[PDB]
Amino acid sequence: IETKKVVVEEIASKLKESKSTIIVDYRGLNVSEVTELRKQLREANVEFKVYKNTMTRRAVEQNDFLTGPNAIAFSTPAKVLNDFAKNHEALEIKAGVIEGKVSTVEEVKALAE
Amino acid sequence: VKLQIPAGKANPAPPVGPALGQAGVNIMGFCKEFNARTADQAGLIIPVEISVYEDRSFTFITKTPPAAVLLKKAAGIESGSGEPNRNKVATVKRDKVREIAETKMPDLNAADVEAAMRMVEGTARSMGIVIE
Amino acid sequence: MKVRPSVKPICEKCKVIRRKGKVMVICENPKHKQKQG
Amino acid sequence: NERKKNANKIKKLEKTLEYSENAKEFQLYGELLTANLYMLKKGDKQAEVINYESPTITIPLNPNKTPSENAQAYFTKYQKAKNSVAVVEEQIRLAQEEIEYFDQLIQQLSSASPRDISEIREELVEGKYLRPHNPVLETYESTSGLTILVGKNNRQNEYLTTRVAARDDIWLHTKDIPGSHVVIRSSEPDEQTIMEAATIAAYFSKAKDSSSVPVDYTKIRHVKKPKPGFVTYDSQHTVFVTPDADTVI
Amino acid sequence: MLLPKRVKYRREHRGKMRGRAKGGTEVHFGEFGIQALEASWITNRQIEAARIAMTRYMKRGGKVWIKIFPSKPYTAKPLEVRMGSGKGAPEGWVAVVKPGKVLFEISGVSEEVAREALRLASHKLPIKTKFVKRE
RNA sequence: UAUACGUUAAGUGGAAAAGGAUGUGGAGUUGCUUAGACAACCAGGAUGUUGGCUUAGAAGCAGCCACCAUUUAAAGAGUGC
RNA sequence: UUGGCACCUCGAUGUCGGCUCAUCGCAUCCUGGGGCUGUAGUCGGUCCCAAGGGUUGGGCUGUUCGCCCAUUAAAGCGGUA
């Protein structure tokens, strides 16, 4: 209970600390491809984590894209992300944000460019 | 398909012959190809993957030896514990832990040397080894 | 069938039900199929 | 009677063993079948098969069974023959241990005194072949004005070897099949005593008055206290020697 | 097959299993025990069956502490015999049991294992039982 | 063919046990639960590793021992086929 | 069934086996209909529903029972003093 409270707290913390973040689906891919992504972002020093939609929303307001499966990628990145996406092509790259400015799909693609 | 095969020994038939007789490819030419690549410590049980496309386009990949193999070469022993945590019978050195870590860093998931070491330490627990 | 008064499930997939006031057991494994009588 | 009986017993076992020895054939067959478990129909009688020297063997089958079933049956028969052979070999080991025990026993009884025969009787009653306290050793003179103790009884010999000396002391016995056990208290005297102990060893041995008997001298620290008096030895040297007279006293 | 070594009288009246037990109504040697809900006589063959059953289920498990002993003997005349002509000869040995009485205990072992073992034993016993634990 | 309140539905009533059961009724305790539970559906369910011993072979699953670490949101050195 | 108890019957309840005559139960031997199978098929095992009908002739023995020969779809178990 308070555990979930702490969780949403640190999520909002790392959120407000970052100034680039991306919001994607994790569905239709094996743990091997997942950990491939994880390793290439480990060497990229780009954080990547997995949370629930409800607590995620609570952290944001502490929007429409927040439903469904949702993992997140902090860069305090989009390059490696879109490269992985072009590779595998079973994903959603649904949203992003930068300096708190909500970034469109095309905009995160442009940062990937 | 995985195969645990010593390097210089290729075509010791009875394990490996069946491993590809279902595939129906040339067992022995493939075996001597495997030796040709694995001109290595004969007895080093290489994990070799093989992938055959339906038209008999076979391609195979040698890989790092197992943790148990490297640790038994380190301790110079034949077998792990028959009852680890009731009878530890083997031991090797933290330097060797570093060595095997740095060896098999390319294959593992753990980007961390120390986390790979923890993985090998769990292996050592499983096979009855202590560390020094 | 396995008619018997000591009717139970055997595996986890065995599913007890009641039918016509009688007790019965269902499973894909027909050897797990039971009934009281 | 008992020793002769045990010898004939193992003769029975050996000549019986020569008629059930089909283990390796079945092992190799199971190996080959598991190697060739993809060319094989269920219903077949035979299998022209190559050994992994590239002979070509024709293994029979059960035309009703699968090759898996057949190969597993070969492994089963290998397992069974292996088991029975292990049993017979254990019985062999038992009988041979007993025979050697009684052979040493008869050596002792040949080179015996009544004082040790009284102990041997109780030893055998303890072994339950029969039915119905510190004096252990006997000694005489030796080289270097020394005393060399011995015991014609297995039990007294063991008592002396264990409780009457240390580990670094030297035990002198036969370097051969069967003989007594004897030594001086902390036997570390000169080569004179080393060669004198060999005479006492060759006197009370499986072949008394045998002029080619080698004696084994070894540190008591390597005296193996593993039937009774099945004492192995290491840290040993050996010297060819011969029997002697009562001057050995 | 338990036995009293020595006894005053090889032949006793049978008795009456009225009321509840005096003592042994609660586990105190062990943790998880079983008690009765009826009254009956119990035999050395029954108790050893139950004992070996639970010990086979447990295979190393802790400690048991049976809480009884078949002190009582019971007679039985030979077969196809008229009445009278003395009391029958002894046959075996018996423990008498009231309800509320603990029979078997367990320690050193988890609750689920204990409950299953005691279930198995109850099915070897004639009477109705309950699973119990220490307070 | 009463009154009121409830129960049972088996013809129980109007024959009987061990034992078995999502039968129903009443009390009671307790875990989880709209910061979203149970079920269902979608997806994942991995790496050292085929944990090691034993075994001809035992590769999560004949059996003995252990049952750790990594990616980790999580995946058991493994629940059943 | 072997039995236990002595309740009717000692001013009489005739007792084994066999013949004739059948009759009832079903815990079914066959026939019928099914489930499961370590049920390939043919044959089977086991269990369930079913008592409609049928359920052999001889040798030995007083015999019942039983063994044997040859058949049969099968050669049922019992109650009725």
DSSP B42-87: TT-EEEEEEEEETTTEEEEEE-PPPHHHHHHHHHT-S---SSTTT-
Which residues in chain D touch residue B21, judged by CB atoms under 8 angstroms apart?
35-36, 38-39
Complete domains list, chain A, with CATH: 1-112 (3.30.70.1730)
Sign (positive or negative) of CA dihedral E99, E104, E110, E115 = negative
**The amino acid at A13:** S
Burial class (CB in 10 A: 0-12, 13-18, 19+), B132: exposed
Q: In what order do the strands lie in the sheet with D138-141?
A: D138-141, D147-151, D181-184, D170-174, D213-219, D236-241
Chain A nearest CA to B107, separation (Å): 12
Burial class (CB in 10 A: 0-12, 13-18, 19+), B25: middle
Nearest of D180, D194, D27 to residue D106 by alpha carbon: D180
Q: In what order do the strands lie in the sheet with C22-26?
A: C2-3, C34-35, C22-26, C15-19
- Among all strands, which nt has the closest C1' to C2 (CA)? G47
CB B124 within 8 A of CB B86: no
Whether residue A30 lies within 8 A of chain B, CB to CB, comes out as no
Q: Write down the domain spans for chain E.
A: 23-135
Task: Please count the residues of chain D.
Answer: 249
- Among all strands, which nt has the closest C1' to E84 (CA)? G4
Chain centre distance of CA D181: 17
Distance, in Å, from the CA atom of E64 to the CA atom of A26, rounded to the nearest integer, reads: 54
Q: Write down the domain spans for chain B.
A: 2-62, 67-131
Nearest of B109, B112, B114, B80 to residue B97 by alpha carbon: B114
Name the CATH topology of B67-131.
Arc Repressor Mutant, subunit A (1.10.10)
Strands (E) across chain E are located at 32-36, 40-43, 72-76, 89-97, 102-104, 129-133
Nearest of D112, D142, B87, C5 to residue D120 by alpha carbon: D112
**E strand or H helix at A81, and its extent?**
helix A78-88
Chain B CA closest to residue A42:
B111
Give the CA D203 to C1' G29 distance in Å: 88
Question: Looking at chain A, which subunits does it touch, using at least 3 CB pairs closer than 8 Å as the criterion?
Answer: B
Burial class (CB in 10 A: 0-12, 13-18, 19+), B94: exposed
SS3 state at B93? coil
Phi, psi of D19 (to 5 degrees): -125, -5
Question: Looking at chain D, which subunits does it touch, using at least 3 CB pairs closer than 8 Å as the criterion?
Answer: B
Q: Which residue of A34, A42, A43, A47 to mutate against B (max B Cβ within 10 Å)?
A: A42
CB contact under 8 A, B109 and A43: no
H and E: helices and strands count for chain A: 5, 5
CB contact under 8 A, A42 and B109: no
Chain D CA closest to residue B19:
D35
Which residues in chain D touch residue B20, judged by CB atoms under 8 angstroms apart?
none
User: Partners of A48 in the beta sheet?
Assistant: A73
CB E4 within 8 A of CB E71: yes
SS3 state at E89? strand
Neighbours of E45 (CB within 10 A): 14
Chain B CA closest to residue D31:
B14
Which residues in chain D touch residue B14, judged by CB atoms under 8 angstroms apart?
31-32, 34-35, 52
Distance, in Å, from the CA atom of D95 to the CA atom of D17, rounded to the nearest integer, reads: 15
Which residues in chain B touch residue A47, judged by CB atoms under 8 angstroms apart?
none
CB E67 within 8 A of CB E103: yes
Report the structure determination method: cryo-EM
C 17-36, residues with C-beta < 7 Å of strand G: 30-31, 33
B127 Rama class: left (phi>0) / alpha (psi -120 to 50) / beta: alpha
Distance, in Å, from the CA atom of D132 to the CA atom of C33, rounded to the nearest integer, reads: 69
CA distances from D167 to A50, B49, D180, D216 (A): 70, 58, 19, 16
DSSP D136-164: --EEEE-GGG-EEEEESSHHHHHHHHHHS
> Which tokens hold the place of A26?
């994790």
CB D87 within 8 A of CB D215: no
Distance, in Å, from the CA atom of E37 to the CA atom of E101, rounded to the nearest integer, reads: 8
Name the CATH topology of B2-62.
Ribosomal protein L11, N-terminal domain (3.30.1550)
CA distances from B86 to B52, B82, D108 (A): 45, 9, 46
Distance, in Å, from the CA atom of E93 to the CA atom of E44, rounded to the nearest integer, reads: 7
SS3 of chain C: CEECCCCCCCCCCCEEEEECCEEEEECCCHHHCEECC
**E strand or H helix at E122, and its extent?**
helix E111-124
Chain centre distance of CA D98: 9
- Among all strands, which nt has the closest C1' to C15 (CA)? F22
For residue E87, the 8-state DSSP code is: P
- Range list of H helices, chain D: 2-17, 23-35, 67-110, 114-126, 154-163, 191-203
Neighbours of B59 (CB within 10 A): 9
Q: How does B1-24 read in b/e, with b if 16+ C-beta sit within 10 Å?
A: eebebbbebbbebbebbbbbbeee
Distance, in Å, from the CA atom of D129 to the CA atom of D152, rounded to the nearest integer, reads: 20
